[PDB]
Each structure stands twice: as structure tokens, then as C-alpha cells.
Amino acid sequence: MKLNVDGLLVYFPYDYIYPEQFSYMRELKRTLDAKGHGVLEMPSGTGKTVSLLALIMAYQRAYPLEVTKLIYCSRTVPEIEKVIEELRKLLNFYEKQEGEKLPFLGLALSSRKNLCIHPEVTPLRFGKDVDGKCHSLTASYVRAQYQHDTSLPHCRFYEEFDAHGREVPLPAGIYNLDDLKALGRRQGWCPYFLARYSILHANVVVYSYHYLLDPKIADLVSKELARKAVVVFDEAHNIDNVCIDSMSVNLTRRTLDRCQGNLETLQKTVLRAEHFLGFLRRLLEYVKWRLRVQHVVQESPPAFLSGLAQRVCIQRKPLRFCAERLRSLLHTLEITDLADFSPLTLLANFATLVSTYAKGFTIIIEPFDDRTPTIANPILHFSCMDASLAIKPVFERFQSVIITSGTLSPLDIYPKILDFHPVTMATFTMTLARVCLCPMIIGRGNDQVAISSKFETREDIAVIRNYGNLLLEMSAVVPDGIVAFFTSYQYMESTVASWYEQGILENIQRNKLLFIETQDGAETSVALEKYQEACENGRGAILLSVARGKVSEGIDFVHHYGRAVIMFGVPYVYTQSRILKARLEYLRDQFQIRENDFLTFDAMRHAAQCVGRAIRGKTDYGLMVFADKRFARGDKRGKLPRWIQEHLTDANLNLTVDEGVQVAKYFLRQMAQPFHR
Amino acid sequence: TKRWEGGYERTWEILKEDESGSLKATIEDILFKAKRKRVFEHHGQVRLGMMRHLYVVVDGSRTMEDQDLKPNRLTCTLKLLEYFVEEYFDQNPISQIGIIVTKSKRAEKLTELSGNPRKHITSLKKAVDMTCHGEPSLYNSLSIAMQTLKHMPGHTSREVLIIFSSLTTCDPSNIYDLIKTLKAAKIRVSVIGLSAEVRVCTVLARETGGTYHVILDESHYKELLTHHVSPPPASSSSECSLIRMGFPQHTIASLSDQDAKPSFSMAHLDGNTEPGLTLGGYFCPQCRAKYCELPVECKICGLTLVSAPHLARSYHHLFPLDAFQEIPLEEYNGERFCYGCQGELKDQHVYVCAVCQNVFCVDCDVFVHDSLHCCPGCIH
DNA sequence: AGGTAGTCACAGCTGATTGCGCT
DNA sequence: GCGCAATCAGCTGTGACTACCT
């Protein structure tokens, strides 16, 4: 309906508005009037997007000059499509409640693989070759030679769009990615090119994080779109982590082998300007020198270029001209396809980065590999350490950047992890007619022995027996599926092997089916499918996985799937690889971040992220248990999101297994009753 | 604003005086206001009914050993099932109850589908001391119930009640195909769980048109069973439903007469105990078979033996008694003696029937509308 | 010739100290 | 070495028992 905020009226598709949504709208309006950044935290995956879009539309209607462009960067494609359809529903509601259209355009952006119409490039599953084939089919030289009408296979969507799609605009009508593809195929135009031509004359547009955090494409996709713009990174509780992936690269034997294989072909094509032809030839030997050197670790981000200029005597300046070479020299060479050429581009980017960005980075070499530690595997990592570098460009170009997700419990660490000036410090806890979740921390077992997953007690028989007993007698009270998370794959497999050795895993087997998540994508998908089908009927199942796995965030356990989520010990990231410790030292000497505090923050963030996916929707309910006495400590409970703290009473913070089972039984029995709206 | 934040209610303002002593008369009206506190309907709900072939499925897994309900789930469940059977046969004259027990991934038909109340109670009492082993199998019990109820006539309402204690079931085949088959067969399935809500039970109840409930405590268990006691509503006229049933007269045998022939009861002959060799009992109108209990379907000729008063007890719902016209005593010009109780009419209001135009006091009107269900004047 | 501030028991609270835990 | 939880000191409420002046 029409919500009347202190200076505006906003239409909302749903007549009923929860108090949390109203408070969130008030806070967001306050932030927009404050013309500053901020961070938000909500406990509901759904209902946030509709409120955000409604308030954005209301603010644009009230202040067209203050806000011109809106960005809703998300994590993956399902989020993009669901927010697109939510925006479509909002626009339909506005049209049905008002009666006249408005000149608002909404489009979704993705990779060229997602948005393409050629049947000769869709079937392949090479994300690094679609762009190369697209560039080969249509480019500046293609347009130049189209004047003579050369008889060669090439894309023709642009050859029609440039003469027919650059004149007619799209003032109204929000289009989804499939809608854009349909429009392009019916008009004979490329969806990507029309999207590029239409972002300038557009109201809202959504895409993924990689189009803003990666500087190589953010500038091209957003340079002078809007000085005064609003961007939001929903579900970005691990944003800093992916920020590291923005400026982290790895080198292996395959990359250098591919480079040495393709440089011969490049030289053969050339002999059919010289400032880089001879420059590139001797670049590989300097980095292959470390291959023959058997050393543990070398750290010299500033002195690496010094070693480069001592071994080969090259100035630092021409490295800065490598990047501009990519758009200049390569287009003269007429590369048939970017395949067997990506390692050269990534090496050039790495050289440019180390020449330019070396103040808050670190070069690491690791002679270690999984199950083949020291045979042949020197891995070079230009690992990033400060998340501010990946976040400065968006903070200096936008006015009200908002970071929101389902788990942002410490609001004082993000503003100091990366350069930020929050003005919000706001948390929201969902409320319903009844308590939909019953978090509890189970400490010592029936033997009055702690079940903490300490490194010195990982192989202890007593804690393994207690975990097995908890999983057994818990599986008989909560039906249709339990999702259990372990610290790591090694610990998980050792624990299940120990359970198999004893006559305890068989007892769990007859209650629920046991499913194990592995690194294989197809195996994980089929295991998830069989778990879902087993939970559909009354058989019930247990899904055992790891907190730091692709299955932790790739799926959401909707109601009746995973009524119970079990955390076996505090999930702590491994301190090896000399990657975590470098970040700890950088945070200590730069941001004055305690190492123990950061480790606890990361562990509790992962635990909350993997435990908060059991509550999707108001009608949904679930159980959340932590099988570690360390969770009972205040410094770790304080790291849980506010919407879980108030439901975690002090009565059950160190209760044993039997009382936890009784609490679970009582909660499920009282939650099985019908409720109202 | 709020309702209680306005003006304070003064309930004592109702009483008034005009002659310094009239208050008594006012309280007399209060006494007249005291009566007629009912809606003149002992039930006030469903005015008809339909025959039911109900099957009760009882879990026999280890979960029945839980002590949530003292002493354990099985004992309280069987006690409440005996109560439910008694009440169900009390409120349904021509219905039938079958009992299936699920145990060790198998289903055993503990009692055949019949209308005898005593047999089911004895079977439950025998099953009180059963051994709980294995895990329940909803698929087998539902398959057996569907197989037995498939051939029942369409006019009968086919119902299956499942008391699911364990939270897990073993299905030898896909259960959703069985659910679709039940939906095509028009079978109502209702589940009353004990521990927590299960997805399969909810889906089954939703698709088959039944109701799924979860027990909070023993009182809630009894309330759910009582709710299941009530027959489902039936259409005004559905089909050609008629059933051939006899009415055995309870002829006892006395040695004074020469027609005293002792005979063993057919039902008692099937028991392990020595059959009762009584003087007489109920004789089948078709084959003159002797029975001791009613209503019991005849084993020989297949005829159903039903007691006429049980059927006739529900006839007042077919012909409800119309409310009498309330008339003040002053406005009625006639005799001032009640037609029913012969008492003098002194109340402010006199009720007159619309048919026989007889006068009944408040007590007689309430008695006729509540218990008698027939106007004494209209009888003549 | 007849009645209330100390005193005792058993609980509560808050204001510090004060030994215990460490991927 | 730091941080969280266990512990005690001091004050107070509640109810009842007891030793010197109108």
C-alpha cells in the first residue's frame, strides 16, 4: 500500500508491512538523505529486495536529480533473475495501481555466454573462449571489411544494430536477460551491444560483483554513467574475501608451458611494434628461474621489480605500457581466437599490477601441492592483503554505497577491514507470531566431557563418541533431513571412518540416510538431488558437508529441507600456506586488528552463514545446534547476528546432549501446530 | 484509541426504581433471563451422516517405547483407541472399523473390517503387550487399506486413520504414486502424529483431502480423536444407497415353554475360549443363527443384524421441532394452565405451538426442544 | 506493672578482585 | 600476556527473638 514516510509516499506491492521492513525503509531513507555510505543487516533473504526496489523507485520519483542510476550487484545469476522478476512484479503493481506507464528501463547484465544467440557458440562450455570468438566474429576490422561485403562467417547482429538499433531507444519497458535475448533475435541485434547502448539511457540495471570489483572491466562498464549513483552489494558477508580474489593470481607449470608453446606461434605470425616483440621474449625466463630454485618462501613485493631490473636490466616504466599494448598490438596481429592466449594476458596483467600495485600486496612462492608436496609444483601467488584497494574505486565514484547481507554481526570490523565511513550501525531482527528458530549450544556430553573440536583433541576417541551419540539420538527427534557441517574434509572423513569402525554409524543408518559431500561437482549435485528426494518422502537423510565448501552457499535449505543444522566444532580456517598469516600481519601492522579476534570473526561468520540458511520465509522454521563448548564463550556468542542472539537464551548455553534433545523435541512439537497470518 | 481508555462502564445502572420496591420485579426478569441459555440443540452441527469404513493404523516401532505419554506411547495410544472405538460406534450405527499394525517394515491386519465393538476392544487389549520392533512402513499399510477398501460401494465414505509415532518410514516403492492412486480411488486419509511434523504425512493428508495433526499432550490427543469421531457431512441425495439388513428379536428361552432350545452362539464358536451355551439370544431373521452381540453381521447368510432403537435414535435430526411462538401472558386470551405439565401459567411469557395451538410454560418448552424433540399436542 | 533498636537466620543486589584458558 | 567467568565484601529486605524505662 501507500507507506507515508516523513516526506514521501511509497507504493508497496504487499498490503501488510512487517515492522522490520518499515524500520529498514526509515533507515534507508535516512541514509539517502544523509548522502553517505553505510552497511545494513537483515535476516530474511526474501522481502529485502522488494523493499529496496520500492524505496529506490520512491526516492527517484521524489528526487529525480539526486539519484539517476541504481546498481544491485549480487553474487550469482539466480539472485539476478529473482531480483529482476521482483522488480517486474513491483512495476506491474505500480501500473495496476496507477494506470499510466513510466519511462523506466531495467536490464540485467551478465557474461557473453549467458547473453548470446549464435547456435555455434552456445553448446561449448569454455568461458574463456566465448569472448575471443565474439571478438573475432565482430570487431573494428570486421566493420571495416563489411563495406566490401566479404564472404566469410561472422556475426551479423551488430551489422544490423549499428544501423537500426542505435536510432530507436527503449524509454519504457523493463527487460530481463531472456527478454533481451528475444528482442535481439527478433530485431537481429546483439543483446550485449544493445545493453551497452542502453545503459546510458536507463533507470536501473543489475549485474554481478565481478563487473565492479575487477578494475579491468568496471571502468569500461561504468566510467561516466552517473556521478551521483547508488550501488548495493546484497548477500556480501564475505565481500572482502572475494575482494582478495579481485587481486589474486596463481602461476603453475601448465601456464608457463602454454606460454612457451604459444610464443613460438606468435613469433611465426609476426614474421609474416618492435618495442614489445623483443620485450616479451625474455620475460618468461625470469619467472621460470624461480621454478628451478628450491626455496621455501620469498617475500619482496617492492624488491621483486628490483630483482627483475637486476637480472634482465629493464626499466619499470615500459611495464606500465604493457596493458595499453593489449588493445593496440593484438588488434594489429588479428588473433584468430583468445584460446591458447589467456596466460599471456594474465602474465601481462600481473606484471602491470606488480609494477603499479605493490604497497599492500605480497608475493608468495609455495613448493607444496595436495598429496604431491615436493615433486614439481612451485606455485606463485600475488595474493592481495587489503580489501580497500578493491573497494576504493566504488567508494570514490558513488555516494551511498550500501553493504547488506544475512550475516554482518560485527559492524565495527568491516569499516576498519576496508576504508569505510559508516553512518548507519543498524541491525534488524525478524519477528513472527512464534519463535521460528531455536538456536542452542551443546557443550559436554553425557560423560561430562567437552566436545570441543580442538586440534589436540581431533583424534580423541571420547569427543568422537560424543559426536556420534549426539548425531544418533538427535536424528530420532528431528525428521526429514539434518544438515551437519564439519571443520574440514580431513576431519570429516576421519570422524566418519571412526564412526564406521565402531558399531554406531549403523544405528544412524537405519534412522536417516547418510550422504557425503565431496569436491566433485557432479557428485555433489547428484548427492544433493538424492538428499532432496529422500527428504521429500518420509525416509529422511543426513547431509554431511564442510563449512568452507561450495555447497555451503550454493544452495538454500528451504522449509522441510534440513529442519536441523548441526555445527560440529567452530570452523577455523587452516593457518598453513602462509596466506592467512600474511593477512594477519598486514591487519596487525596496518589496521591494528587482533589476530585472535580476526580468526574468531572469520570462524563465526562462516558458522552463521552456513547455519542461517535454514530459515527462508516467514512460515519456514528450523533448528540450529552448535556442538562445541567454545561457542558458549561470550566472545564468540557476540559474533552471532542480532536476529539469533535474542532467541539464544542463557538457559541453554552449555547443556548436555540429553537436555538438548529434549529442547529440540519440545520446540518441534510446539512448532508443528498451525498458526495465523 | 482503545476500547478501555474511554468511559468506564457502570453495569449497575440497569436497575431502576419507581415505586420504592419495584426492584424485585426487575430481578424476576433476570430470572426469566437466566433460563433459555441454550440454542435448543444438543449438538447444533451436522444434521445428517454417512456410512464410514474407517481403518486405524498403529505404529509398532521402537519409537512407541518412548515415555512422552505415561507409561509409554503404545499404552496411552491403545487406551485412547479403545475410547475412540466406543464413541465412534456409539455415534455411528452402521459404520465399520478395521485395525492394521505396522511393524518391522511390514503391515499386519490385526482385525478384519467389521462393526462389532467388543471384538476390536479385545484385540486392542491383547495387542497392549505386543513387542515393538523394526520400523513402520506406511506404504504397506496404505496398500492393504486401499486393497480392502477398493471394492467397497461408492456411497460409503472410505477413511483411513494413521497414528504415526516414528518419524521415518521405509517405502519399498515410490509413495507418491500410491498417493495419486488413493486420490483417484477417493480415499480420505488422516494422520495424527506424536513427535513432530513429517513432510510425507502432510502431503498425503493435503492431497487425499484428510487432515494432519500433531499431538501436544494426552488431552490434545483425546481432542483430536473426538474431532475424528464426528461423521463427515453428506450430500442431500447422492446415489441409490440401500443395504439389506435384518432386525433380530431378542428372544430368551424359558423352561416353562416347550420351545426352549439351547444353542451355541455362532460368534462364540469362533473364539478360543469355550463358546457360551446360553438359553437364547438374537436369532437371524434369514437363517435363524444365534448371536449374543449387536450389531453383528451374520457369518452364515451375510445379512447385517442391526438394533432398531440405535437407528431410530437419530431420527429427530430428520424432523427437528419448530420453535414455539413466544407470547406474553397478557396478550394471550385463553386457558392459563400449561398443556404439558398442567401447571398454572404465571410467567411473563407463554409459548404456543404453531400446529396444535397449545400453551407450554418455559420449563415444558425447554424440555420439549431439548429432550422430547416432539410436541405432545401434535402427537394426539 | 507492660513495649522497640540490636541481633540472627537466609535470601537478594551491585562493586571490585582473582585465578583459569591458549588454533 | 590478555580476556572471560568465578568469587567475595559490603549493603539491604523479611521475619522473629531479646534486654532497659513510663
Ligand code: SF4
Ligand atoms: S556479437 Fe553478440 S550475438 Fe554475436 S557472437 Fe558476440 S555476443 Fe553473440
Ligand SMILES: [Zn+2]
Ligand atoms: Zn443369517
Ligand SMILES: [Zn+2]
Ligand atoms: Zn408446563
Ligand SMILES: [Zn+2]
Ligand atoms: Zn404442537
